Each structure stands twice: as structure tokens, then as C-alpha cells.
Design a protein around this ligand. Structure first.
Ligand SMILES: CSCCNc1cc(-n2nc(C(F)(F)F)c3c2CC(C)(C)CC3=O)ccc1C(N)=O
Ligand SMILES: CSCCNc1cc(-n2nc(C(F)(F)F)c3c2CC(C)(C)CC3=O)ccc1C(N)=O
Lengths: 213, 213
């Protein structure tokens, strides 16, 4: 009755921990790939709810939103796709991230590029190229909304609040690094969206803050 | 498997919140009553396990320990009594604290003294006379160990860790206010223990840090 919420703390698997330390510390020059990777993830979540709707009509217009916030120095990638249940968030999609990370690091060793992250299903982690903390708020039809957060110190948290009113989908918030403020600028974001826009079957809306007339 | 622990956050009932704000801010000159109140609480917990042992032998030597720590600026009152389950901690002993607080504040209004706190069953809160944060670690035979913590901001937390190895009883840790450092000194603690020692049916051990010979 007087309950405000709860926070569970988990340690990452050893592999994911190495990936995070690698990404957050790399000098990789083409950091902008993070946007493509998050929009790619968002698109796959919209595909999952779409492919599901081809069996049950009970699960409106699927879209992807890119929201900069110069005040909080954050960048958000919002979608209204399938969403993630607590088991999805708490396990880091389970065997998906673990096998993916091992295989991705094995690819980089053998000659690969950081840009190949997505081929291993672990493109979400590229968010740490431009961010030092990432907040993932997801709501799946089969569960309530949860908040995943990590700053890459070997751990992450799962926060549950009964005061929650989050609709189906995923909201990924990127707390931008001092040097990565360029990803707030709407001219940089427009260029990047257009760059992959033709390859994503869903509308991508950019919500930016002046018209001279 | 990779779980480190959890923290639940609750808001105090309105009455308990007023009691806490009153205690933590009062100029009451005889703050030393906090020790009597905690030792009294500790004794009642030893009585509960004793009265229980008069029916079942399965529930060794019941004692009360007073532990100062000049390094962390903390004072601890440890007992090996009945302990408190999660429901005991999460509800603040339920109807006990709520009715007690209302009745205690009604007594003070009518002419009462802060020292009467214990007659209302809410003497635990007197710990806020000398402390700005109180940590309560309790283990009951019917449950695992939990950690209650509050700094009197209208809320408290319940922390559960699977890494826990706390034996039956209650450990109350008082994070002492700048002006209340006198309660670390072993001469002050010896005087106070002796002052009520004859009225408590359990041994009270003081664990202090020099013998000149
Ligand atoms: C495809 S529909 C269901 C899954 N969708 C998504 C998955 C991720 N991924 N992927 C991975 C992993 F494991 F690397 F693949 C991870 C995450 C986020 C995390 C918080 C679970 C940590 C994590 O490990 C990110 C965003 C979405 C989205 N936008 O829906
Ligand atoms: C008597 S055997 C079972 C209960 N024993 C104890 C109870 C308290 N009390 N009493 C109250 C209340 F409600 F004011 F009475 C409260 C608490 C601690 C709290 C964290 C539950 C917050 C709180 O509200 C403190 C210490 C012990 C002990 N040493 O065993």
C-alpha cells in the first residue's frame, strides 16, 4: 500500500562485461553507428509485433522516435514494438547476448570491425560508444513496465514501480559523454536518420526544438 | 544466479513521519534515553524467544551487546532475541507503531515527557534523538535476514541480499549526529549501561577498544 518501488541489482556475465569495457573505452572513430544499431533494434521490435499481428489482431501505427534533450544532455530512441518482459531484461535476452558477445569479440580478433556488432545481435551495446549510462524502459503486453539501467561497472539494475503508466514498447535513454554532445544537434540527427531511413520499413520521427520568417 | 540483492522503498504512515520529524529536530536535553529504549527493545526480543522456548526447545545464552565504532562514528545495539521477519519490518510492526505514535503524541500534548516513548511501544524511534540514519538488520527463524534503513525523509528501505549470513537476532546501527559523539566514549557508555543494568534480566556486554601497566 505504502510501496514506492523496487530495484534489483545483477552482475553482468563475464563476456558482456568485457564487451562493455571494450566499447566504453574504444577510440573507434565512427561512433555514429550507435544510432543505426538502436533504430535497427527498434525496427526488429516493430517486426516482432507485426509478425505476431499476422495471427492475433488484438496486438496501432508502428513508428520509431528519436528524441534529443539538450537540458538533460540525453538522447532517446523510442519505439512502440513488442517490448520486453522482466525475464527478457533480467537475463539480457539470455543465450542471445552471451553467445553473441563471445562471437563478436572472436570476429574483431580475426579482422572484423566495430560496425559488425549488429550481425551478432548485440548492437544495443554500441550505445556505450557515445554514452556513459543507458536507461532502458520497456513494456511488453504479457508484463508490467520495468527500467534497466547500467553505467558499465560490471553491474546493472532492474527497477519496478507500481506508479508506472508506460505504454507498449521500448524507450532507450542515452546519457551522453562530454565529448559526444554533437548527437543532440538536430542537423547531425537529420543526416544520420536519412542515411539509413530508406532501409527501415517504419517511419522515423525526430522530435527537435526556430523558424525564421 | 548473477543476483546481488534488492531494495524496496516505502513511504512511512503520516503519524510515524510526524514522530520522526519531531524526534530528529527536538532540543530535548536528556537524549541518552535512546540507549535505555534500544536495550529495552532488545530485552523484550530476548523475552519473546524465552517465552517461546517454554513450548519448543528447538529455539543458546541470550545477551545484549553495545558496540561503539569511532572509525565509522556509529553505535550498535545487538541482541540474539526472536528477530523480525520481512512482514514485521515492512509494516513497522503494523498496528503497533501506528496506534502507539498517535497515542504518544497525544500524551506529549497533554503534559507528557519524551522519556514516556516506551510506554507506547515506539521507543525504537528515540534512536533519532542522537542519530540521523538508523540501520536495522534482523533475522527471525521463520525468514531470511533483511536490512531496514531510514534517514527520516518520509521513507525507508528494505534490503534483501542472498549473500547474507546473519544469525538470529537484531543489530540496530545508529549513525551518530556531529554533536552526539559522546555516545562513542566508553566512560559514557559504562555509566549508562550500569544505570539500567539491574532492571534487565540479560547480560549487557560493552565491546570497547588501553590498559596502563
Ligand atoms: C527484438 S524485440 C525484443 C528485444 N529488443 C531489444 C533488445 C535490445 N537488447 N538487445 C540486447 C542483447 F542481448 F545484446 F541482444 C540487450 C538489449 C537491451 C537489454 C536492456 C535487454 C540489454 C541487452 O543485453 C535492445 C533494445 C531492444 C528494443 N528496442 O526492443
Ligand atoms: C519485541 S521483539 C520484535 C520487535 N523488536 C524490535 C522492534 C523495534 N521496533 N519497534 C518499532 C515500533 F513499531 F515502533 F514499535 C519499530 C521497530 C524497528 C523497525 C525497523 C521495525 C521500525 C519500527 O517501527 C526495534 C527493535 C526491536 C528488537 N530489538 O527486536
Amino acid at each position: 500500500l505504502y510501496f514506492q518501488g523496487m530495484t534489483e541489482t545483477f552482475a553482468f556475465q563475464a563476456e558482456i562485461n568485457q564487451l562493455m569495457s571494450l566499447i566504453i573505452n574504444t577510440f573507434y572513430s565512427n561512433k555514429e553507428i550507435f544510432l543505426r544499431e538502436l533504430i535497427s533494434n527498434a525496427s526488429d521490435a516493430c517486426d516482432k509485433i507485426r509478425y505476431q499481428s499476422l495471427t492475433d489482431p488484438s496486438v496501432p501505427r508502428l513508428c520509431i522516435r528519436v528524441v534529443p534533450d539538450k537540458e538533460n544532455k540525453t538522447l532517446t530512441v523510442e519505439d512502440n514494438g513488442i517490448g520486453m518482459t522482466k525475464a527478457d531484461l533480467v537475463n539480457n535476452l539470455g543465450t542471445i547476448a552471451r553467445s553473441g558477445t563471445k562471437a563478436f569479440m572472436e570476429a574483431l580478433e580475426a579482422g572484423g570491425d566495430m560496425s559488425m556488432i549488429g550481425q551478432f545481435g548485440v548492437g544495443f551495446y554500441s550505445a556505450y560508444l557515445v554514452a556513459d549510462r543507458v536507461t532502458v524502459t520497456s513494456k511488453n503486453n504479457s508484463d508490467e513496465s520495468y527500467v534497466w539501467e547500467s553505467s558499465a561497472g560490471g553491474t546493472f539494475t532492474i527497477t519496478s514501480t507500481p506508479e508506472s503508466d508506460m505504454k507498449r514498447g521500448t524507450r532507450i535513454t542515452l546519457h551522453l559523454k562530454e565529448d559526444q554532445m554533437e548527437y543532440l544537434e538536430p542537423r547531425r540527427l537529420k543526416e544520420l536518420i536519412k542515411k539509413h531511413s530508406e532501409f527501415i520499413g517504419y517511419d522515423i520521427e525526430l522530435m527537435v526544438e526556430t523558424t525564421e520568417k
